[PDB]
Amino acid sequence: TTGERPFSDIITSVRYWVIHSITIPALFIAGWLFVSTGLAYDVFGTPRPDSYYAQEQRSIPLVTDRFEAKQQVETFLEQLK
Amino acid sequence: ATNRDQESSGFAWWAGNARLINLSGKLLGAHVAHAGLIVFWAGAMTLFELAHFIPEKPMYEQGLILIPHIATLGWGVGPGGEVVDTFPFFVVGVVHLISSAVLGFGGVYHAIRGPETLEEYSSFFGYDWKDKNKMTTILGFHLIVLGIGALLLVAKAMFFGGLYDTWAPGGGDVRVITNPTLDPRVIFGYLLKSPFGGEGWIVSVNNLEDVVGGHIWIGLICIAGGIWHILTTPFGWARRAFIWSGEAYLSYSLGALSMMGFIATCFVWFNNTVYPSEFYGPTGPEASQAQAMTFLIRDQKLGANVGSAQGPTGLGKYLMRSPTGEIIFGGETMRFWDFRGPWLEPLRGPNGLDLNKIKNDIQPWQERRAAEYMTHAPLGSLNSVGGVATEINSVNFVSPRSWLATSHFVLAFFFLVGHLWHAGRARAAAAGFEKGIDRESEPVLSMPSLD
Amino acid sequence: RGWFDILDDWLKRDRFVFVGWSGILLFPCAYLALGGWLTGTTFVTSWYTHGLASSYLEGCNFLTVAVSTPANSMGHSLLLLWGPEAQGDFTRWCQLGGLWTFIALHGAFGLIGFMLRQFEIARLVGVRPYNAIAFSAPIAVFVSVFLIYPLGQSSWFFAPSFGVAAIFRFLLFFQGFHNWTLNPFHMMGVAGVLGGALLCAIHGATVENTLFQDGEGASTFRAFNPTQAEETYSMVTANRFWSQIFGIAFSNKRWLHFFMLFVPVTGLWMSAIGVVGLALNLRSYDFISQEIRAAEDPEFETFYTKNLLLNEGIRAWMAPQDQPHENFVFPEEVLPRGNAL
Amino acid sequence: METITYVFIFACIIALFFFAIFFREPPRIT
Amino acid sequence: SYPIFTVRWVAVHTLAVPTIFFLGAIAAMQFIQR
Amino acid sequence: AELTPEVLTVPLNSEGKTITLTEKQYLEGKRLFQYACASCHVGGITKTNPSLDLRTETLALATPPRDNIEGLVDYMKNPTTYDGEQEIAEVHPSLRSADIFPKMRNLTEKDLVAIAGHILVEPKILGDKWGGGKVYY
Amino acid sequence: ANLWERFCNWVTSTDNRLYVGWFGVIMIPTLLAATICFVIAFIAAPPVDIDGIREPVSGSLLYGNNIITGAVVPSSNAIGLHFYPIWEAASLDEWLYNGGPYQLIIFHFLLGASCYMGRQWELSYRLGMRPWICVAYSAPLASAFAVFLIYPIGQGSFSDGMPLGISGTFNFMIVFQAEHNILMHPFHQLGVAGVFGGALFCAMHGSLVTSSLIRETTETESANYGYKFGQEEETYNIVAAHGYFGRLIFQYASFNNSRSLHFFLAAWPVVGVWFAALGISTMAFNLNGFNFNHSVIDAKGNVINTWADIINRANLGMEVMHERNAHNFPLDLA
Ligand code: CLA
Ligand code: CLA
Ligand code: CLA
Ligand code: CLA
Ligand code: CLA
Ligand SMILES: CC1=C(/C=C/C(C)=C/C=C/C(C)=C/C=C/C=C(C)/C=C/C=C(C)/C=C/C2=C(C)CCCC2(C)C)C(C)(C)CCC1
Ligand SMILES: CC1=C(/C=C/C(C)=C/C=C/C(C)=C/C=C/C=C(C)/C=C/C=C(C)/C=C/C2=C(C)CCCC2(C)C)C(C)(C)CCC1
Ligand SMILES: CC1=C(/C=C/C(C)=C/C=C/C(C)=C/C=C/C=C(C)/C=C/C=C(C)/C=C/C2=C(C)CCCC2(C)C)C(C)(C)CCC1
Ligand SMILES: CCCCCCCCCCCCO[C@@H]1O[C@H](CO)[C@@H](O[C@H]2O[C@H](CO)[C@@H](O)[C@H](O)[C@H]2O)[C@H](O)[C@H]1O
Ligand code: OEX
Ligand SMILES: [Cl-]
Ligand SMILES: [Cl-]
Ligand SMILES: [Fe+2]
């Protein structure tokens, strides 16, 4: 009763579904592509399934140095090649 | 629309089936359509189970619960529970699935198309809940139906091929039952047995002659009580004891179904006779006993004297005594010494496990059976990872016994809750306070204060 | 009519979601703590801080995803995005556990924003502020567990990680290392939580079963009108019922409802005090008199002594993988095990 | 001393139950 | 006669917009092999 | 790390010749191991006799050596004790006792090679986890 | 009136200070039997061989325990599910050694507590109330049946029932997690939601009612004297409370119907505790919580640990250590 249009009037209107039959799939597809292009891995730094370990490595790339942690990760990533 | 909203019927949408309490034609349709759902599931699940069923794996390794019921009734199985003919399983599924369409058609018909009440159409089919003599008549018809149903199991066992006998000489096999136990000191003796350990009440029934003879007694009791209820009206003490209403009769059934659900949970968990281990896997007790046996066999093959080996505590590592002196397996499985199974009974003597038979007479089929049962214990995770909670992923196994016991405990419990809900409500509704306290004659205000 | 008063007018407008001055704090901080949690659990690993996969992107499910704590080597660093550890690199900040501190700090300020909202709305509508006062307990729990506990410890690494199973690890860590079940402050917490759920169940059920018949429907919810002056249920009948069943009963509705505030709020405060002790390892780990007796009498056994052995198993079997900064190599022969298993 | 102390406190609680039930302030309708 | 854009509209879309994006991302993750 | 040819190259026999499995027969071997063997040999141990595992170093000291494909396949045809003194087909699953172990019935020679490949590859992947038991979980 | 009609009127009398009733004629002897035996056992019972391994555990105060460590120890593993009343023992000393008191207490208790539920139905009927307080009580009742009876049945021994003591309770919980991964079982998780939510809702409802109390008193007196027992008027302004809480969240999130609100307060912890009880009672048949141990594997096949894998290490530590002398074979099967 705060003056906004009721939700059950909006989502039953055709103008809402003209708009949202485009915006809702486009968002869903944009999320799908963030993963399937691999951009999600490069934005967040998450390992792909073949980038946890070097080929004969069994040890974990744990960060041990506070002020050079940024370099420890980069040295761990450069050992993935 | 008749009784299809809250204002006209007094019940909200979420109590919507209570609008059917006095509409016997729509209520009949609810029941017939729901019976169709049950028969549909039985049919659809069997065909699902059969479509997935690998004949070369045991049934219990395959997440099957209906195929074991059919195999236990004698269909599709040869010696040792091996499957020889998948076609009886196909028939049971198909015929259920087709009959569900007939029940579904008649349920939907009476629910939506036919007369809303039956009392104008027919005096035989219409009923009042308050009509005690009509209620016992419908009860009597249904008892006769159930009594014939018990005799069908007797008919299958005696005159139509038999039942799977896990205890049959030479291994489990489908055996025609020729001499069922008719003697009531045995049949009704099971009713008087303690439910506790070593006794087990009716769960301890361990031979098909007692199973079949009990079903003869139950079928004739149900037919006799069926006739009795058609011919009598509830006596005076019964009329003063019970609430006589639709919700009350529902509550009484809910109490009965809950009790039966709890009994089935124990049946599937402990009984390896009507739930043969070759179909359902080993029981919890059976697997634990199978482990002690397996390591007894291995260690004895290495040269160990098993009757004289001390465990860490001083009790015998492989063998010890029960609290009444019987020689039993040691370790934690001391709790399961009342386990009885066809793979283990040849090692038992008068005093329990016989040490000379253990030294000399364990066969390779018993060694294979013990190892198979130890590795198929009913322990697994909800995502069907077999073994203890600490196990790694690999084995995809949860025993049918675990699935059947857990499901039926859950169902029996909520049906107990439903009994309490409906029994309390039927009491209150009959006395007339189910909708609340009347503000004018509040009963507590007419009572003396407690202090 | 200055700019402050016009801004105050707009912030306090009747709308679908009330904003307020507290909403300036609450709404960004809550959105970021919530959004940071979903972002981290969807896309962010814990591989460099814990050696764990913790995201849907790596294959975890809702039970196993977490935004995990930073590495122990970070100490109690705020781990700001612009700080000396990430140096402005967002990708590295996520890899070092900067999302944990992001969620914890924005969660903290959001919780403040939420209690400020409770005060602001209660003041505007003209009710007393007991709901804000009751919210002090979840705040006390959040501050003690998520901030004071790791601040007492070596680093943020030992705080709870924001995940379902990660929290379960936190629970089992506190058993094995702190014997937290033995702690009388936790016990007071349990009593307040379980006593609170009991009061919730019993008060709801008592009201529903002493209702006055105020209408003709068998479904009785329609018989209530919020503008009625009359009590909807019989306090007198409820009192007589409980006095005869249990011996005692409420007879004052105001005391009843206060006691319902008091019980879970006091319990949560008590547990918070226990966790503050555990920040400094001031545990109620052992009963000295039983340990003296058990050491000298190898036949004395209790459930307390059995629990200590369980705790020793937890520590030894979990520490190498739970604390990978320590580089514990526990050879198989040093691990405590009973016979056979 | 310990055992006596625990039993003593317990026994007082049981006594308090007795007074709280049988010697409560009586609920009076007013 | 009602407005379209409100504080309510903003609050809805600050949640619903990333939610649908995240649901598409997580759906695509179901088809990643190792 | 990937599942390379060099990970998938296992000794074919005892003389010294190797075979490199494909990723498809590694994954069929893990599937067939799980179906036929993992109830007793989950993770490379042996639940019903823990003294003997499926570590390559234990398979090498068996008689005849089982640390190669041909040695492992032969065990699945005619299993023996660890010293090769007793044939144990009446209590261990094999093709000659496929009547009493019905999961052994339709296993082909390619299926036994796939299982044998999985047993030899898996320790190169898991290290001491394979055959180590709950200590390495 | 005959003596039976007079006795029945006494039993079902609403004028008795404590209501007896027909359930009460069972509840009263059973609960007194369980209480008396519990108190004596907790103070004075000698050590009990819980694990059946001649390794007796001291549970009573006189034998070295305090309030926190003391317990009535579960009956012996050698007994299993066997019924062990006093008459089955050759002497009280044997009954004590084997944990007889535990069976006596839990059996009388469960029978007594079941009749407490019936007695709650019974009085509500005599008072003209609606009958469903007893349904709410069925949640903790089911929980008690789960830990004292159903869990032992599925595990095959009353030695696996929860001990009657505080540290004994903790031992039961830790071993349960080791063996069943209860934390990863959704029924336990619903239990937690039931109890945290219940405490939350208890705090919320208490606080909102207290916040909306109508002024009838001065500052120098407790606001609780503003309510008179059995007054007809509402003592709080539910419209004010709805107006607050619907602005705290949003309007449609808040109850304006007190009957709906109180039903929710009933249903939330009750349904949650029912799921908790079913959790225990289904783990009684070893259908365990989710196992994700080694669920995450890299491209080579390396196990990548998750938080579930860290839980498993803790679970392993409890498992290898629990009942440290009782196991003779590699698998813990019951
Ligand atoms: C097993 C489940 C089950 C069954 C058999 C019923 C049956 C019934 N309900 Mg109940 N109900 C149920 C569950 C069930 N309900 C649930 C879960 C709820 C909560 C949502 C309700 C809430 C509820 C309310 C509020 C009401 C009922 C009512 C009714 C009755 C009349 C319905 C009607 O005429 O509407 C007409 C509906 C239609 C015409 C839609 C067509 C639906 C058809 C029947 C579906 C069948 C499809 C099937 C695949 C086709 C089979 C054909 C084939 C076999 C040949 C009917 C006897 C009504 C009543 O009691 O009135 C007196 C009523 O008011 N129900
Ligand atoms: C609980 C089961 C049940 C009950 C009590 C009723 C009762 C009724 N039906 Mg309904 N009906 C049902 C199921 C049921 N029906 C099913 C499954 C269908 C789909 C086939 C129908 C389709 C249907 C139609 C189209 C009509 C009725 C009618 C009637 C009314 C008169 C019937 C009569 O006098 O025939 C006399 C009965 C006989 C001569 C014997 C019955 C015939 C069958 C073949 C015997 C089967 C018996 C056997 C034990 C079944 C085992 C089933 C088990 C496997 C589940 C009566 C109220 C009529 C009506 O509504 O009037 C307005 C009507 O027109 N029914
Ligand atoms: C679904 C099955 C069913 C149902 C619902 C009924 C229902 C009824 N029967 Mg019927 N009856 C049935 C089957 C059934 N009967 C059968 C199969 C027979 C033949 C054996 C009979 C023979 C029969 C007779 C002779 C009488 C009834 C009567 C009645 C009415 C009252 C019963 C009563 O008070 O119960 C409650 C029972 C009691 C209060 C007796 C004491 C029970 C104790 C307290 C409990 C003992 C059981 C306990 C749980 C232990 C179980 C295990 C134990 C064996 C060790 C009620 C309408 C009475 C009637 O009015 O008929 C006109 C009556 O006289 N029935
Ligand atoms: C044969 C068994 C049986 C029968 C015929 C009835 C019949 C009735 N019940 Mg009862 N009830 C039962 C068992 C039964 N109940 C049990 C076992 C319980 C304990 C849970 C109850 C508890 C109960 C309550 C609390 C109430 C009733 C009510 C009623 C009446 C209306 C029901 C309705 O419209 O629901 C409509 C159906 C729904 C609203 C949907 C329910 C959905 C459930 C909760 C979850 C579904 C389970 C499913 C496996 C989980 C979700 C799966 C997912 C994949 C979708 C009707 C007389 C009402 C009443 O008293 O009327 C007088 C009422 O308030 N029943
Ligand atoms: C009410 C809103 C609110 C609050 C209280 C916070 C609070 C916080 N944020 Mg968050 N943030 C917010 C909204 C908020 N944020 C929004 C809307 C976004 C998206 C744009 C972010 C994005 C964000 C990121 C990416 C990060 C934070 C971080 C932080 C933490 C450190 C902030 C800091 O040190 O800045 C210091 C600045 C101030 C405190 C300003 C105070 C105002 C002064 C008194 C006025 C004078 C300043 C002067 C004019 C500046 C001139 C400088 C000149 C001399 C060169 C702190 C908990 C960091 C964190 O979480 O670390 C783990 C972090 O990495 N925030
Ligand atoms: C009333 C009502 C209701 C209900 C409903 C119901 C319950 C119904 C039922 C229904 C039913 C219950 C139905 C059934 C159906 C069936 C069918 C339809 C069948 C089919 C069959 C077929 C066709 C098959 C085929 C085949 C074969 C033969 C062989 C093999 C293969 C196959 C499978 C293909 C509701 C709730 C909704 C609501 C409203 C009202
Ligand atoms: C088949 C079989 C068998 C047989 C069996 C039999 C023979 C059975 C019977 C059964 C029976 C024979 C049963 C019965 C039951 C009963 C019941 C369960 C009861 C109930 C009751 C009640 C419910 C009541 C109530 C009340 C009271 C108490 C008071 C008053 C009121 C009233 C009435 C309500 C055997 C095991 C050999 C084997 C297997 C198979
Ligand atoms: C961190 C960060 C940030 C932020 C971000 C954000 C703010 C985010 C957001 C985000 C979000 C906002 C997201 C969303 C998501 C969502 C989701 C993912 C959902 C899901 C759902 C589902 C899954 C459903 C399900 C369910 C439930 C829950 C319950 C009921 C039942 C059902 C089944 C329906 C920034 C850049 C500022 C800065 C830097 C850092
Ligand atoms: C468990 C073993 C016993 C099984 C019992 C089953 C036997 C079946 C018949 C029993 C008869 C019960 O019959 C019942 O007896 C009582 C007491 O005698 C009668 O008498 C009763 O009268 C009224 C109510 O009617 C009561 O207020 C009064 O206190 C009582 O004497 C009941 O009205 C009658 O219904
Ligand atoms: O008692 Mn008590 O805890 Ca049930 O699992 Mn087996 O049994 Mn013993 O080890 Mn683990
Ligand atoms: Cl232990
Ligand atoms: Cl053992
Ligand atoms: Fe209230």
For residue B83, list its beta bridge partners: B77
Spatial CA neighbour of B416 closest among B304, B254, B286: B254
Which tokens in the block code for residue B20?
A: 């059917």
Q: For residue A46, give the DSSP letter.
A: P
Rg (CA), chain G: 25
Contact between G131 and B332 using a beta-carbon 8 Å cutoff? no
With an 8 Å Cβ cutoff, is A55 touching chain G?
yes
Spatial CA neighbour of B107 closest among B44, B161, B30: B30
| H/E segment holding residue C162 | strand C162-163
B195 CA to centre of ligand 7 in angstroms = 14
β pairing state of G287-288 and B380-381:
parallel
Separation of first and last alpha carbons in chain D: 49
With an 8 Å Cβ cutoff, is A28 touching chain E?
yes
For residue B300, list its beta bridge partners: none
Q: Which chains touch C (3 or more CB pairs under 8 A)?
A: A, B, D, E, G
8 Å CB contact between C59 and C41: no
Cα E15 to Cα G269: distance, rounded to the nearest angstrom: 29
8 Å CB contact between B54 and B114: no
Helix crossing, F109-126 with F69-77: angle to 10°? Answer: 130
DSSP annotation string for G236-261 = B-HHHHHHHHHHHS-GGGS---HHHH
8 Å CB contact between C209 and G130: yes
β pairing state of B327-329 and F18-20:
unpaired
Burial label for C296, CB within 10 Å (0-12, 13-18, 19+), is exposed
Half-sphere exposure of C224 (CA within 13 A, CB side): 22
8 Å CB contact between C213 and G137: no
Cα C104 to Cα C137: distance, rounded to the nearest angstrom: 17
8 Å CB contact between G128 and C241: no
Cα C18 to Cα C283: distance, rounded to the nearest angstrom: 44
Half-sphere exposure of A68 (CA within 13 A, CB side): 6
> What are the residues of chain C with a beta carbon less than 8 Å away from any beta carbon of chain A?
14-16, 43-45, 47-49, 51, 55, 57-58, 71, 73-75, 77, 84-87, 89-92, 94-96, 324-325
Pocket lined around ligand 8, Cβ cut-off 6 Å? C 31-32, 35-36, 38-39; E 15, 18-19, 22-23
Q: SS3 of F19, please?
A: strand
Cα B85 to Cα C228: distance, rounded to the nearest angstrom: 72
Half-sphere exposure of A31 (CA within 13 A, CB side): 24
For residue C67, list its beta bridge partners: C162
- Amino acid G145 reads F
Nearest to C236 among B12, B435, B445 (CB): B445
For G147, other C-beta atoms within 10 Å of its C-beta total 22
Chain F residue whose CA is closest to B366: F91
Cα C162 to Cα C151: distance, rounded to the nearest angstrom: 17
| H/E segment holding residue C85 | none
Question: Which protein residues have their CB within 5 A of the ion that is ligand 11?
Answer: C 306; G 322-323
Q: What is the 3-state secondary structure (H, E, C) of C45-74?
A: CECCCCCECCCHHHCCCCCCCEECCCCHHH
Q: Which residues of E touch A34 (CB under 8 A)?
A: 21, 24-25, 28
Cα G13 to Cα G11: distance, rounded to the nearest angstrom: 6
Q: SS3 of A71, please?
A: helix
Residue of G3, G4, G7, G10 with the most ligand 9 atoms within 8 Å of its CB, for mutation: G4
Q: In what order do the strands lie in the sheet with B327-329?
A: B319-321, B327-329, B352-353, B348-349
G277 CA to centre of ligand 13 in angstroms = 26
Q: SS3 of C97, please?
A: coil
The answer to the question of residue A26 being in a domain is yes
Q: Domain limits of chain C?
A: 1-341
Cα C158 to Cα C147: distance, rounded to the nearest angstrom: 10
Work out how many domains chain A is built from and give that number.
1
Go through chain A and tell me how many residues it has. Answer: 81
8 Å CB contact between G151 and B269: no
For tokens 């975890």, the residue is C60
Pocket lined around ligand 3, Cβ cut-off 6 Å? B 136, 139, 143, 191-192, 221-222, 224-225, 228-229, 232, 234-235, 238, 241
For B342, other C-beta atoms within 10 Å of its C-beta total 21
8 Å CB contact between C229 and G236: no
8 Å CB contact between C285 and C179: yes
Indicate which atom in ligand 7 lies nearest the CA of residue B255: 23
Q: What is the 3-state secondary structure (H, E, C) of chain G?
A: CCHHHHHHHHHCCCCCCCCCHHHHHHHHHHHHHHHHHHHHHHHHCCCECCCCCCCCECCCHHHCCCCCCCEECCCCCCCCCCCCCHHHCCCHHHHHHCCHHHHHHHHHHHHHHHHHHHHHHHHHHHCCCCCCHHHHHHHHHHHHHHHHHHHHHHHCCHHHCCCEEHHHHHHHHHHHHHHHCHHHCHHHHHHHHHHHHHHHHHHHHHHHHHHCECCCCCCCCCHHHHCCCCCCECCECHHHHHHHHHHHCCHHHCCCCHHHHHHHHHHHHHHHHHHHHHHHHHHCCCEECCCCCCCCECCCCCECCCHHHHHHHHHHHHHHHCCCCCCCCCCCCC
- Amino acid G23 reads F
The answer to the question of residue A1 being in a domain is no
Which tokens in the block code for residue G175?
A: 């071993």
8 Å CB contact between B57 and F105: no
Cα G165 to Cα G71: distance, rounded to the nearest angstrom: 4
8 Å CB contact between C80 and C71: no
Contact between B331 and G129 using a beta-carbon 8 Å cutoff? no
Cα C186 to Cα C193: distance, rounded to the nearest angstrom: 10
Q: Which residues of F touch B395 (CB under 8 A)?
A: 34, 38-39, 42
> What's the distance, CA G102 to chain centroid?
17
Buried b or exposed e, range C80-98, using 16+ CB within 10 angstroms: ebebebbeebebbbbbbbb
Cα F86 to Cα F84: distance, rounded to the nearest angstrom: 6
Burial label for G105, CB within 10 Å (0-12, 13-18, 19+), is buried
8 Å CB contact between B419 and G114: no
Buried b or exposed e, range B230-256, using 16+ CB within 10 angstroms: beeebeeeeeeeebbbbbbbbbeebbe
Separation of first and last alpha carbons in chain A: 62
Go through chain G and tell me how many residues it has. Answer: 334
Cα B93 to Cα A51: distance, rounded to the nearest angstrom: 50
- Cβ-Cβ contacts under 8 Å for G24 (sequence gap 6 or more): G11, G115, G119, G122
Q: Which residues of B touch G90 (CB under 8 A)?
A: none
Spatial CA neighbour of G48 closest among G23, G24, G78, G28: G78
Which tokens in the block code for residue A41?
A: 């891995």
8 Å CB contact between F54 and F119: yes
Q: For residue C129, give the DSSP letter.
A: S
Instruction: Please state how this structure was obtained.
Output: cryo-EM
Cα dihedral: C319, C321, C323, C325 (round 10): 130
**Range of the structural domain that residue A70 is part of:** 7-79
Spatial CA neighbour of B26 closest among B91, B93, B89, B108: B108
Which tokens in the block code for residue B450?
A: 């407690």
For tokens 């000295």, the residue is C288
Which tokens in the block code for residue C254?
A: 């105001």
β pairing state of G287-288 and C66-67:
unpaired
Cα G113 to Cα G142: distance, rounded to the nearest angstrom: 10
Helix crossing, C253-279 with C184-209: angle to 10°? Answer: 160
**What residue spans of B302-399 are helical by DSSP H?**
355-360, 364-374
8 Å CB contact between C180 and G256: no
C50 is in an annotated binding site: no
For B94, other C-beta atoms within 10 Å of its C-beta total 14
3-state helix, strand, coil in chain F (%, to 5): 45, 5, 50
Q: Which chains touch B (3 or more CB pairs under 8 A)?
A: C, D, F, G
For B25, other C-beta atoms within 10 Å of its C-beta total 22
Which tokens in the block code for residue F23?
A: 């990723």
Beta strands in chain A (DSSP E): none
Spatial CA neighbour of C18 closest among C136, C166, C123: C123
| H/E segment holding residue G63 | none
B187 CA to centre of ligand 7 in angstroms = 14
Cα B46 to Cα B58: distance, rounded to the nearest angstrom: 16
8 Å CB contact between B314 and B94: no
For residue B173, list its beta bridge partners: B165
**Domain at A17, CATH number:** 1.20.5.860
Burial label for C323, CB within 10 Å (0-12, 13-18, 19+), is middle
Burial label for A2, CB within 10 Å (0-12, 13-18, 19+), is middle
DSSP annotation string for G265-327 = HHHHHHHHHHHHHHHHHHHTTTEES---TT--B-SS--B---HHHHHHHHHHHHHHHTTTTT-
Cα–Cα distance list, C19 to C2, C11, F110, G207, G243 (Å): 20, 6, 69, 22, 15
8 Å CB contact between C290 and C179: no
Indicate which atom in ligand 8 lies nearest the CA of residue E14: 12
Q: Which phi and psi angles does C164 have, rounded to 5°?
A: -65, -60
Contact between B12 and C219 using a beta-carbon 8 Å cutoff? yes
Which tokens in the block code for residue G54?
A: 């001649």
- Cβ-Cβ contacts under 8 Å for B378 (sequence gap 6 or more): B281, B282, B283, B284, B287, B398, B399, B401, B402, G285, G286
| CA angle, F80 then F83 then F87, to 5° | 25
Spatial CA neighbour of B292 closest among B341, B340, B328: B328
- Amino acid G236 reads Y
Q: Which chains touch G (3 or more CB pairs under 8 A)?
A: A, B, C, D, E, F
Mutate to test the interface with C, among B6, B435, B440 (most CBs of C within 10 A): B435
- Amino acid C166 reads A
Cα C93 to Cα C108: distance, rounded to the nearest angstrom: 20
| CA angle, B307 then B310 then B314, to 5° | 130
Separation of first and last alpha carbons in chain B: 54
Nearest to C16 among G132, G250, G326 (CB): G250
Buried b or exposed e, range B143-158, using 16+ CB within 10 angstroms: bbebbeebbebbebbb
| H/E segment holding residue G71 | strand G71-72
8 Å CB contact between G19 and G126: yes
8 Å CB contact between C129 and C63: no
Q: Which residues of C touch A78 (CB under 8 A)?
A: none
**Range of the structural domain that residue F80 is part of:** 1-137
DSSP annotation string for B105-143 = HHHHIIIIIS-S-STTT-TTT---TT-HHHHHHHHHHHH
- Cβ-Cβ contacts under 8 Å for B192 (sequence gap 6 or more): none
β pairing state of B319-321 and C66-67:
unpaired
8 Å CB contact between G178 and G188: no
For D18, other C-beta atoms within 10 Å of its C-beta total 11
Chain E residue whose CA is closest to C10: E7
Which tokens in the block code for residue F132?
A: 């180590």
Q: Which residues of G touch E12 (CB under 8 A)?
A: none
Contact between D3 and G231 using a beta-carbon 8 Å cutoff? no
Spatial CA neighbour of B374 closest among B270, B268, B316, B293: B293
**What residue spans of C217-326 are helical by DSSP H?**
235-246, 253-279, 288-296, 303-322
Which tokens in the block code for residue G126?
A: 């005599």
Work out how many domains chain F is built from and give that number.
1
D17 CA to centre of ligand 13 in angstroms = 26
G233 Rama class: left (phi>0) / alpha (psi -120 to 50) / beta: beta
Spatial CA neighbour of B12 closest among G267, C219, G263, C224: C219
Go through chain B and tell me how many residues it has. Answer: 451
Cα–Cα distance list, C163 to B362, C92, C150, C151, G184 (Å): 53, 21, 17, 20, 13
Cα G294 to Cα G308: distance, rounded to the nearest angstrom: 9
Chain G residue whose CA is closest to D22: G17
Contact between A50 and F1 using a beta-carbon 8 Å cutoff? yes
Spatial CA neighbour of F18 closest among F2, F7, F31, F4: F7
